[model samples]
Target: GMGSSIFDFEVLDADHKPYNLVQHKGSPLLIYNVASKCGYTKGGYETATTLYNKYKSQGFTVLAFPSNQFGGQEPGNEEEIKEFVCTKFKAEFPIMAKINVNGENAHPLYEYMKKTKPGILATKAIKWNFTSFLIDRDGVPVERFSPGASVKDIEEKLIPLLGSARL
Candidate 1:
């Protein structure tokens, strides 16, 4: 991962084009491990959409990565997962390529964040899908949310990080 820059990661936007996280440098980012088949998928998608709609124009971005690590939860190609997210929850944010969030194959971005800001459980291992990490405009890791934490829980902290978004 010599070229890793939080942007070197190859993720895809809704259009399936490569999305570099650094392209959103000035914005606060909410990065989450998403799983189409996971229990939190629907709620996470819904909240993510809401957050995006509310803050995209105000310099905030949300990035999701579909993962299969926990019980083969994500279990599908990006196209199908994208379709489901869009149709079911109307998500419009970026979805990173399918990646492993735990163990040896864990994506570099997660590895960096976990090492930099370990979660409440103090373990580098991601327990489940929808694990979230918030990154500020400076590309610094801010907060970590466990899988079971609700979207509202994140928004509570996220809004403050963005300051006041006018209209």
Candidate 2:
């Protein structure tokens, strides 16, 4: 709704290398605002990586955006954050550079998603980290997953969109 290309908003990765979502056009993406210290972090990372490894061959991708806006859970810098994720969770999915998930300075793609697909209560603001969005092959934000919703819930929704994927 902002009229800017959401894909053009480039973010850094664990290594400080730029990661642009624009390059992944034509593929379905599951984008998550992650927090390493949050309660959902471990489970979210596990489920996301599992789905990514299982369906990557069929054009499914998972993008993790570490955010510290909620409760200061993800307090580490880039390299430290990366190390924690990789070492503890064995996170193999693509983790975008850390970013703010809410407020005026929020990342463009996240801003678009929250505004476009407000939750059941009709609030656009994300209550916590690990908020997730499913982008279809056409780049449309098809679904929204709440923080309390478990990994299995989203995976169920994913299979229908990624029909070619097998459990």
Candidate 3:
């Protein structure tokens, strides 16, 4: 089996417009659950911008989904959240619509990711905001990073995979 296609789901962008994942079929993705008020927020947002700028032309992107499930950190609506991250971090990448990363209301895309790549010790639940999942060019889930994982570690892992994408 080719596994569940990441392209199968449709999600809304910050502007409330529908965006399909299929459009990014041939590219690799670094998808994360983001929050503006969390402790990891600043560093995570900065790293996301750095990584996106460093690798976007090479077919890599960071897809951030604002989630308030952790500590009620992301209290703003779509518009507010978009402005906060964009203005503060200068993030040019896509910041998708707000979503729940856990529980029954979780987005299908995240549900699929958790099922495909559970956390440490095989836990399916996301520990906190900033938990990330890396997907290869073929839409295969490759690795899961905890909220504490460093950007340097993520960059190292992505470099080899990004090269593989060029082939």
Candidate 4:
């Protein structure tokens, strides 16, 4: 509401290559804060990958942004983190460059997301790692999920979105 859509920002891939979200205009996105050492790491990764595999053909994709703000759980560099994600979870989606999801150092895209949805009761602060945001094909932030929210919850929301997109 404050700014424009997610397409208004430029992001970096795991290799630090720059790209704009405009290229993904017609696809839905599931963007989440990730950590390699958090307790939610294994299960979260599995869920992300599973959902990705299930709906990728439907123009749905997951984007992971590794963050160390919570408990210093993700300390690995870009290559190490990428390897961990690819090897441990066999993730097929793109893993973006590491970023700060909160505070003044937060990425501009994340700042937009939080401002778009905010936390409970319009609080625009991320509470912990793995905080997920669902974006529609038009790049609008549709929903926000907490770290503990199950992948099934995401699937439920995504199903209707996918259906509406086809209509």
Ranking by lDDT: 4, 3, 2, 1
lDDT tens readout by residue for model 4, 1-167:
44568878888776558855567668787887666444445356767777678887787878877674432333222333443442212257667766766666777888788778863334767655565687788777788776666788787777777655434
Candidate 3's C-alpha runs over 4 A off are: 1-3, 37-42, 68-90, 119-122, 165-167
lDDT of each: 0.62, 0.62, 0.65, 0.66
Give a tens-digit lDDT track for model 2, residues 53-114: 88788688887776744323332223234434431222688877556666655667777876
Of 1 and 4, which scores higher on lDDT? 4
**Candidate 4: segments with Cα more than 4 A from true spot:** 37-42, 68-90, 119-122, 165-167
List TM-score per model, in order: 0.71, 0.73, 0.77, 0.77
Specify the poorest-scoring 10-residue window by lDDT in model 4: 70-79
**Residue-wise lDDT of candidate 3 within 66-133, one digit each (tens)?**
67443233322233344344321225777776576666667787778878887453577764656667
- Tens digits of per-residue lDDT for model 1, 50-71: 6777877768887776674432
What's the CA error at residue 81 for candidate 2, in Å? 12
Say which prediction, candidate 3 or candidate 4, comes out ahead on lDDT: 4
